[PDB]
Symmetry: C2
Subunit: 188 residues, 2 copies
């Protein structure tokens, strides 16, 4: 059909639950999922990894791949989910540029959690190796105090609906309710 496709943006600071949530949305809505960190990991596996500067350069490149791949999916009329710790200062204009070549209707989910919970997750994920080593995640005492005192990520000013999901206490999260929230908005 001629309908404008939906672009579901899942954002949040690192460790706020955006990975799990975006994956649940992909399974629940049967939609393609483009994740910055997943793209970075494909690149670390193909080109190698080293230090934080390389991680940053690979991340900037992964973000470029995310927008490139999104455009061709949206141009086919298919909806999709994009997940990253999006930055208002740079991603607002990237989303505008995307919209110009591949029109979409935005739906945004922002994940948040307490500093203490975020610090616990960052540490355990790195200790238990759930996190790819190439990311070279800043895990020093200063880094963790910055994580702890950061507050919630600002959402992208895209228009359209926004849901904020606090994952501080995961037991309180009803994933199907979140999927249904998106479905209702896709239906409109």
């Amino acid at each position: 059909g001629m309908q404008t496709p939906a672009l579901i943006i899942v954002t949040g600071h690192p460790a706020t639950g955006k990975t799990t949530l975006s994956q649940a949305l992909a399974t629940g809505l049967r939609l393609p999922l483009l994740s910055k960190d997943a793209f970075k990991e494909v690149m670390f596996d193909g080109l190698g990894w080293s230090d934080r500067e390389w991680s940053r350069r690979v991340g900037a490149t992964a973000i470029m791949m995310l927008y490139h791949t999104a455009a061709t999916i949206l141009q086919s009329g298919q909806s999709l989910i994009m997940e990253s710790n999006f930055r208002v200062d740079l991603d607002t204009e990237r989303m505008q540029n995307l919209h110009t070549i591949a029109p979409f209707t935005p739906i945004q989910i922002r994940c948040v959690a307490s500093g203490d919970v975020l610090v616990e997750r960052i540490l355990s994920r790195i200790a238990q190796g759930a996190r790819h080593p190439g990311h070279c995640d800043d895990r020093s005492p200063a880094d963790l105090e910055l994580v702890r005192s950061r507050g919630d990520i600002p959402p992208l000013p895209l228009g359209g609906p926004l849901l904020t999901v606090d994952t501080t206490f995961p037991e309180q999260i009803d994933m199907n309710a979140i999927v249904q929230w998106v479905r209702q908005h896709l239906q409109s």
Copy 2:
């Protein structure tokens, strides 16, 4: 839709017309297009250039990115086009692995053209900012790329004389096979 999605594979050696043709298929069928060269270009722009082994590594990584992206698109039930100079020895297994995690119905288009025309195109692309004598000799004498043994329909398109290519006919050839698999 619950129909198995199609995976349209556009293969060919460099400069055989696989780029233009895959773009015509994407726009003509309104499907996503994943191109090895296009992914490589995004990576060179973000990471830079160096010795030609780097380009080789970037190429290998772009391919991995192609299969990564294809999987999620196919898993949603959406059909797509993948364009590359696919290699029988490595991409046969990668396509099998993809099928396991993201079932698809393959449709293949292989582009070919005379070596002389291929050299001309490559030289002009090199000259028009868009190649050793060994590189060019390999281009001229190499012969046609082997198609991937994936089953499904195969169409070979000889682009030595582009004026005689009916692009719509090719679109409808694929579209008829899509209707056949619905």
